Amino acid sequence: ANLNQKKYPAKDDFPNFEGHKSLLSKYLTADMYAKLRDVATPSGYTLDRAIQNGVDNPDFHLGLLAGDEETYTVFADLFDPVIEEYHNGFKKTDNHKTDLDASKILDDVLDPAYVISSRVRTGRNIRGMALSPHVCRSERRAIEKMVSEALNSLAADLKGKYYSLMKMDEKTQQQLIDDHFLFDRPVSRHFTSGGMARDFPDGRGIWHNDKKNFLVWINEEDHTRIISMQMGGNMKEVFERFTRGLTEVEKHIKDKTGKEFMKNDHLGFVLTCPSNLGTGVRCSVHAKLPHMAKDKRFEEICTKMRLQKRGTSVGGVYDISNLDRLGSSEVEQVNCVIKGVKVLIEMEKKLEKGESIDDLVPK
Amino acid sequence: ANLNQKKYPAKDDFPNFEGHKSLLSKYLTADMYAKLRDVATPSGYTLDRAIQNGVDNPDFHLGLLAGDEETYTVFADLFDPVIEEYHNGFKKTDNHKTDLDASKILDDVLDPAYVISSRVRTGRNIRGMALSPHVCRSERRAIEKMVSEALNSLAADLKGKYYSLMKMDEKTQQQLIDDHFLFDRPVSRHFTSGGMARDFPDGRGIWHNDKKNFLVWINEEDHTRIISMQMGGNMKEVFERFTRGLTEVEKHIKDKTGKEFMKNDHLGFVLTCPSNLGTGVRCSVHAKLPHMAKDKRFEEICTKMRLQKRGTSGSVGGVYDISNLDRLGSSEVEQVNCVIKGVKVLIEMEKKLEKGESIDDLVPK
Numbered sequence: 001a002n003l004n005q006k007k008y009p010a011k012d013d014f015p016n017f018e019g020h021k022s023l024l025s026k027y028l029t030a031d032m033y034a035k036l037r038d039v040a041t042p043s044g045y046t047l048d049r050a051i052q053n054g055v056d057n058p059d060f061h062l063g064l065l066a067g068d069e070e071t072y073t074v075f076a077d078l079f080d081p082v083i084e085e086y087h088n089g090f091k092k093t094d095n096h097k098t099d100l101d102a103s104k105i106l107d108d109v110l111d112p113a114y115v116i117s118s119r120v121r122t123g124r125n126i127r128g129m130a131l132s133p134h135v136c137r138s139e140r141r142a143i144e145k146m147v148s149e150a151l152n153s154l155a156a157d158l159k160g161k162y163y164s165l166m167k168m169d170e171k172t173q174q175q176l177i178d179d180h181f182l183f184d185r186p187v188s189r190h191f192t193s194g195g196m197a198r199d200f201p202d203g204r205g206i207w208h209n210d211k212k213n214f215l216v217w218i219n220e221e222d223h224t225r226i227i228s229m230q231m232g233g234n235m236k237e238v239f240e241r242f243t244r245g246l247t248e249v250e251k252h253i254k255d256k257t258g259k260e261f262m263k264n265d266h267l268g269f270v271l272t273c274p275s276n277l278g279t280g281v282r283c284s285v286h287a288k289l290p291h292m293a294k295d296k297r298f299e300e301i302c303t304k305m306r307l308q309k310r311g312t313s314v315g316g317v318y319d320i321s322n323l324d325r326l327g328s329s330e331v332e333q334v335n336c337v338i339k340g341v342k343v344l345i346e347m348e349k350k351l352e353k354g355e356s357i358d359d360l361v362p363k
Numbered sequence: 364a365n366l367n368q369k370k371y372p373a374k375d376d377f378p379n380f381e382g383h384k385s386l387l388s389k390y391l392t393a394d395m396y397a398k399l400r401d402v403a404t405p406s407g408y409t410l411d412r413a414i415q416n417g418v419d420n421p422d423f424h425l426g427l428l429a430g431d432e433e434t435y436t437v438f439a440d441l442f443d444p445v446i447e448e449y450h451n452g453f454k455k456t457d458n459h460k461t462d463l464d465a466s467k468i469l470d471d472v473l474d475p476a477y478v479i480s481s482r483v484r485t486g487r488n489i490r491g492m493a494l495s496p497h498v499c500r501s502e503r504r505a506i507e508k509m510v511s512e513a514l515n516s517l518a519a520d521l522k523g524k525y526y527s528l529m530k531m532d533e534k535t536q537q538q539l540i541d542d543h544f545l546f547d548r549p550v551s552r553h554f555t556s557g558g559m560a561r562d563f564p565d566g567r568g569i570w571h572n573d574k575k576n577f578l579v580w581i582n583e584e585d586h587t588r589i590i591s592m593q594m595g596g597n598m599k600e601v602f603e604r605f606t607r608g609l610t611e612v613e614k615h616i617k618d619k620t621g622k623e624f625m626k627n628d629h630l631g632f633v634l635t636c637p638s639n640l641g642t643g644v645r646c647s648v649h650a651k652l653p654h655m656a657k658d659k660r661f662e663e664i665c666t667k668m669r670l671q672k673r674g675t676s677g678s679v680g681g682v683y684d685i686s687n688l689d690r691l692g693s694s695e696v697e698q699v700n701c702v703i704k705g706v707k708v709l710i711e712m713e714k715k716l717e718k719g720e721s722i723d724d725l726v727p728k
C-alpha cells in the first residue's frame with residue numbers, strides 16, 4: 001500500500017466517477033470509500049487495487065477484481081451489492097448450490113449441421129494463494145507446479161502434455177494457435193489495469209490431452225481455466241468428460257499437497273471477477289444461425305431463454321452460452337443451453353423454409 | 364506488499380532473466396534479490412514494484428523505476444551499479460553539481476541557415492511525494508493543484524493557461540495535438556508495467572504560455588516535465604526563459620506549500636527513471652547536416668564532443684536532432700554549452716564538406 005495515503009482526507013482519494021458506467025461507480029459511495037480506503041486484506045490487498053480496473057476504464061460494466069479470497073468479505077460493503085445487481089437479485093443471505101452430476105444432463109445431441117462445436121469451461125482457484133491481481137511469482141510458480149503435476153497424472157484418453165509459455169519452440173507456438181489453444185497474452189486494458197499481467201509469461205502455460213478435447217490454461221485470469229470441448233452437439237459427453245477431469249485434477253492436488261479449490265457456501269466457487277462466481281461455468285456452442293441473425297428478435301429471444309449470443313463482430317456464426325452463473329447449478333446452466341439451442345435450431349430451420357417461428361418464441 | 368510473498372524462499376520469487384537485455388538483468392543477482400525482496404521503502408514501495416517494468420519487458424535497457432526518493436537508497440545495491448553503467452562511470456561516491464546560471468550560457472546564435480529549432484527539456488518531482496509508479500490519487504491531485512497554481516501565477520512573457528485532461532473537449536484536444544502539446548495516454552508498456560498509468564486522466568494536465576514557447580506536462584512520468592523551445596538557434600534565449608520559468612514556479616510552490624523540488628547531493632534532481640537523474644536535461648537542436656550524415660566518423664565525433672545524434676524528418680533529408688549525451692556528473696550549464704559549442708563545430712565541418720574539403724584535422728583525435 002502507499003503508506004502516506006492514509007494521511008490524506010479520504011475525499012482527496014475518492015475516484016472521480018463522472019462519465020462511468022460501472023456497478024463499481026454506482027455502489028462505491030464517498031462514505032463507503034472513506035470507510036474502507038485504509039482497510040487491507042490479510043495478504044495486503046487494498047481497496048484501491050480492487051477497484052483500479054473500473055477507475056481506469058469508465059466503459060466497463062463491473063469494475064472490480066478480487067486479489068484474494070478475503071477480498072469478498074473484507075470489502076463486502078462494495079462487493080455484496082455489486083454481486084446482487086450483476087447476478088439478478090442474489091443477496092448476501094442467498095446461497096449457491098453446486099451440482100456436478102453428469103447423469104442429470106439432457107442427453108439430446110444438438111444437430112451438428114448447426115452446432116460446429118460444444119464446450120464447457122470453468123475456472124478454479126487454489127485456496128491459500130492470492131488471485132491473479134495480487135499473486136506473486138513464487139505463489140504463481142507453486143500453482144503452476146501443482147496443477148501441471150496433476151494434469152500430467154491423467155491417463156488413457158485424458159493423457160496429455162504441458163506447454164509452458166516461457167519454454168516455447170517456434171514449431172510449438174504456431175501449432176497451438178493452429179488449434180487455437182493459445183490464450184491472448186495480457187494486453188487488454190482489463191488485465192493491465194487489474195494487476196493481472198505482471199511477470200508474463202512467467203508461471204503461465206497451457207495443458208491439453210492428445211485427443212484435443214480437454215484443455216487447461218494455467219495462471220491467466222484464474223489459477224486454472226478448465227475446458228472440455230468437441231466437434232458436434234453431444235453436450236452431455238462434453239460435460240461428463242469435464243466432470244471426470246475436474247474430479248481427478250482436484251483429487252491429485254489434494255492427495256499431493258493437501259490443497260483444495262476455493263469455495264464457500266455463499267458464493268460457491270470463488271473466482272477473480274465477481275461476474276464468474278457460483279459455477280464459473282460458460283457452457284457454449286458455436287452455431288450457424290444466419291437467418292436468426294437477420295431477425296430483430298434474436299437478442300430478446302436469447303435473453304428470454306437465459307442465453308447470451310456473441311458473434312465475431314461473420315457467417316451468422318454465434319457463440320451461444322448460459323447467461324446465469326450464481327444461484328443455479330452447473331446441471332441447470334448446461335441444460336438451459338441445451339434446451340435453448342434446440343429451440344434456436346428449430347427456428348433457424350423454419351426460417352430457411354420461409355415458415356413462421358412466431359409460435360416458437362418463448363413467452 | 365503481498366504479505367504471502369515472505370512465506371516463500373526468495374529463490375521461488377527470483378525473476379527468470381533468460382533472454383533479458385537490461386542493466387536490471389545484469390546486476391540483480393539471486394543473492395541480491397534474496398537480500399532485498401522483503402525490504403520496503405518507508406512509503407511502502409517494494410523491490411518487485413521497482414523492477415516490474417523490466418521483468419515484464421526483456422528488451423528495455425534499464426528495467427527499473429523509482430517509487431519515491433528512498434528507492435534509490437533502500438535498493439542502492441541494485442540502483443548504484445545500474446546508474447554507474449548507464450551514466451558512463453558515475454560512482455556511488457561521486458556527487459552531482461547543479462548549475463542553472465543562465466548568465467553562463469554562451470551567447471553564440473547558431474547559424475539559422477543550419478539550425479532549424481532549439482529546445483531544452485527537464486523533469487522535476489516534488490520532495491516528499493511519491494513518484495508516478497507509486498503515487499496515490501490524493502498526492503497526485505495535490506501535486507496538480509500546487510503546480511497548476513504556480514503556473515497560473517506566471518505573468519508577462521510567461522503568462523499562460525492550464526488545460527486539465529479530465530473532460531477535455533474534442534476541440535481542445537485537437538488544438539493541442541496540432542501544437543504537439545498533448546502527451547500520450549499511458550498505453551505503452553513502460554507505463555503499464557511501471558504502475559504509472561493508474562487513474563488516468565485523473566490529476567494529469569498540460570500548461571503552456573500564450574507565446575507557445577514554454578510548455579509543462581503535469582503528472583505524466585514525472586510530476587512535471589518542463590520544456591522551452593523556439594525556431595532558430597538562439598539557445599541562450601531558450602535556456603534563459605527555461606530557468607526564469609523554473610525559478611518562478613519553484614518559488615511559488617515553496618511560498619504556498621513549503622514544498623520544493625526533489626533533489627539531493629548525490630543524484631542532483633531525482634527523477635522516476637534512473638536515465639533522467641542529475642540535470643534531467645535534454646538540450647537539443649534540429650540541424651541540417653546532410654554531408655556529415657555521409658561521413659562514417661559522424662557518430663564518433665559526436666561522442667567525442669559529448670553529444671548524441673538522431674536523424675529526423677517530417678520532407679527534407681539530412682536533418683539531425685543533436686543533443687547532450689550527459690545527465691549526471693556534469694551541470695546544466697555544462698550540458699547546454701556542450702550543445703552550443705558542438706553544433707558550432709559540426710556546422711564548420713559541414714561547410715567544409717560542402718566544398719569537398721577535408722575535415723581530417725578537425726576531427727578530435
Ligand SMILES: [Mg+2]
Nearest residue numbers: 001002046364
Ligand atoms: Mg498496493
